[PDB]
Amino acid sequence: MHKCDITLQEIIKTLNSLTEQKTLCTELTVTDIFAASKNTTEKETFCRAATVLRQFYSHHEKDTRCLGATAQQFHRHKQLIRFLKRLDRNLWGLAGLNSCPVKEANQSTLENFLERLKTIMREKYSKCSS
């Protein structure tokens, strides 16, 4: 119909934003798990995913280098962190498992990572439903 797994709907909006308005912080290249969990199921892509992202927002909250540009950026980066965690929390649901070690598999400039994640979510969102 228009909302299979509730998590999705919420996720979508959360992802949507972070990418919509990118900064100089979504370029803090992280692990591009997409190029490793290729030989597994989404669940796992997501197991490592969660781990990766979690660290990202949790560790950079007070990185106060990229969020200390002028004033506007400061405020914008803060929003990103919120959304990163917000999405991570929900993500877990879809994943199905809990957590996994992280084994770098090339790098992704956050903006990109998100873009892919978002697309995926959507693909299912508007298919499984109607």
Cβ atoms of 118 and 15 closer than 8 Å: yes
Question: Which residues have a Cβ under 8 Å from the Cβ of 52 and sit 6 or more positions away?
Answer: 30, 31, 33, 102
d(CA 126, CA 92): 20
With H, G, I as helix, E, B as strand and everything else as coil, classify residue 30: strand
Method used to determine the 3D structure:
NMR
- Domain at 122, CATH number: 1.20.1250.10
Q: Are 43 and 96 contacting, i.e. CB atoms less than 8 angstroms apart?
A: yes
Q: Which residue has the tokens 């405020």?
A: 75
Segments forming the whole domain that contains residue 15:
1-130
**How many CA atoms, within 13 angstroms, populate the side-chain half-sphere of residue 15?**
22
Closest CA to 52 of 62, 37, 63: 37
Number of separate domains in the chain: 1
How far apart, in whole angstroms, are the C-alpha atoms of residue 37 and residue 74? 34
Residue with tokens 């992704």: 108
CA distance 128 to 17: 23
Phi first, then psi: give them for residue 69, nearest 5 degrees: -100, -50
Phi, psi of 56 (to 5 degrees): -40, -70
